[PDB]
Amino acid sequence: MNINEILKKLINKSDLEINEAEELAKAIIRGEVPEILVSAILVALRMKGESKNEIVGFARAMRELAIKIDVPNAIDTAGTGGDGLGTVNVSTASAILLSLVNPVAKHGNRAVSGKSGSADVLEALGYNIIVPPERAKELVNKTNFVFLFAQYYHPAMKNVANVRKTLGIRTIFNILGPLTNPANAKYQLMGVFSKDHLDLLSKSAYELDFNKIILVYGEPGIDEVSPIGNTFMKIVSKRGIEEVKLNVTDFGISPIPIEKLIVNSAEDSAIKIVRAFLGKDEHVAEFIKINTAVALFALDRVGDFREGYEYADHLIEKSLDKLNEIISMNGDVTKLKTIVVKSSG
Amino acid sequence: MNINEILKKLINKSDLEINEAEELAKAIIRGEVPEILVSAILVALRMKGESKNEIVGFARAMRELAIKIDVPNAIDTAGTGLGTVNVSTASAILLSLVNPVAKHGNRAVSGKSGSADVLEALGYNIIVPPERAKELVNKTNFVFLFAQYYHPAMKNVANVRKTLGIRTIFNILGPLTNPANAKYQLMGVFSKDHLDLLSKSAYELDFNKIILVYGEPGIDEVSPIGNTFMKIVSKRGIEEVKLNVTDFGISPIPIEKLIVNSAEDSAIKIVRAFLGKDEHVAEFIKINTAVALFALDRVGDFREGYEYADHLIEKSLDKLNEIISMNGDVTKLKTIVVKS
Ligand SMILES: Nc1ccccc1C(=O)O
Ligand SMILES: Nc1ccccc1C(=O)O
């Protein structure tokens, strides 16, 4: 395993083998590779176009080096992120409804800019994002929800932080977050930012060992279920990968005006979310529901997408209540309430 | 000039504008860009494939930041790993008989095959201060410009190139950044692909005439064994030209006779060639000098240049002694001569 050899291989645009990639990612994540080569490799990897074997090798490296808690039965809802519009953090609200019907081990992080990351939104609601493993398991048993902070459960990732920071461009690490759940959740609704990554990440998930994971791409260009048009889906399980297309109306709704679904900070997201829980915002609430509908289908509790949206309707009703208990047990209820107020409670 | 914008642009595999690439190069060569980004940038450039404008941009940048001296009237024979003897250095010597030569070059990484290694083995003092450089060109019509010193800014990208260990855009710029700003030049390239690219870049670097060549089986000089693909670049345009060593009238030289494995051995073969004691090497020296003579427009064709070179090689040893006597140690040259 020589870095220089791996780099020439990449310069020649030839894909890496699984364990070749896994040893490369380990060396990188452990801080054994000079910053200059980590840089060259990440750029070469992206310009070559990372492959299935690459993604799988890196994902397995990160899982090996990660801090783990056990909750396979749990479900996660994390997208890749991607550069785009900047819609409201549905994966975080959709995760609140889901705790009402199944343990949720949400994997997330802080966003680099306007605080569009789930860790920022949750912090805005008053949640204590730093949950040690012993207590995390405790919180999932009492509230059926726990937030797993990437920077906390992947301490070795601090070894690639400066390079990623300095480069300032997306790399292979920006699509690995959702495939590296510290609780090893076997169910997941992974949002992807492009129809290509849809196929790439699905073939990779197939070899990552999930019971059922659904990857989705939102028609506008969103890493979530599309509010306006079709939603391209991939449902991977131990028995294959199903392709599924879906318009917003198949849920029994009329196109949700994007204008109302856009946010420009962690607080506006927190506020809008709550406002939807308070029934004071149809659109944002309808957006949350369609996303929750799919997550429910992945749990195979609901056998249809229209049905899932319906059950999500019931769920959102106990949502603020659920949110209150979640925060009061691990966080500051004060903020939550000053937000309920800023969102008219 | 925002490096992240440039980076993203390269990541999307799109070429840069000339001055966009020039500002990027100036910032890099000035050491104003974190190593992490210089690294990402060089790698993106290589993987995207450097275009004409990026080459021009970088060359113009190194030219401005380089330690300069002025001898536009001079010619240079700098090119861009078979171990063949360095004929551009010997060839530079013949040319100094009829025109000022400002030879730009570095040492070879490996077994001293670089112009600087050969010259030093001949007894020449390859480290020539810029103020002394122009005096030596007036007095002897020849001077060697050690790139490593005439391009001090390059230290800002040394650690990065060292760590990457792969070729970058920098491995092909040297010949386009002559410190004396020589307008006449013969520059070898190591692949046909670099012929088209470098010729188009060179086209825009303000030469009076530059001849680019690629010789089989893969040499940055005129092929002594077969074809030589050549690009004649000038204000009037780019001439595509193919050639065969047999058009010089000679028979293809056996490659084994041109290869050396030592700086001193290369010095010895050049002198034996100068003494009439090695036809093959001297034939390889003359076919290279012939194209350069054509670059200076001293001859009307390659055949005339070859015969002209015949006359120049007969005088090159004494010329060599004159050059070294003014800058270097003639005792080292008398030693190389002792047994050649
Ligand atoms: N997209 C993610 C999902 C989960 C954890 C981290 C990330 C991240 O981008 O760092
Ligand atoms: N960006 C990430 C992706 C996956 C795991 C951890 C991180 C992190 O920043 O700590």
Ligand SMILES: Nc1ccccc1C(=O)O
């Ligand atoms: N590698 C180079 C290319 C051009 C000019 C100088 C150098 C140098 O190393 O000094």
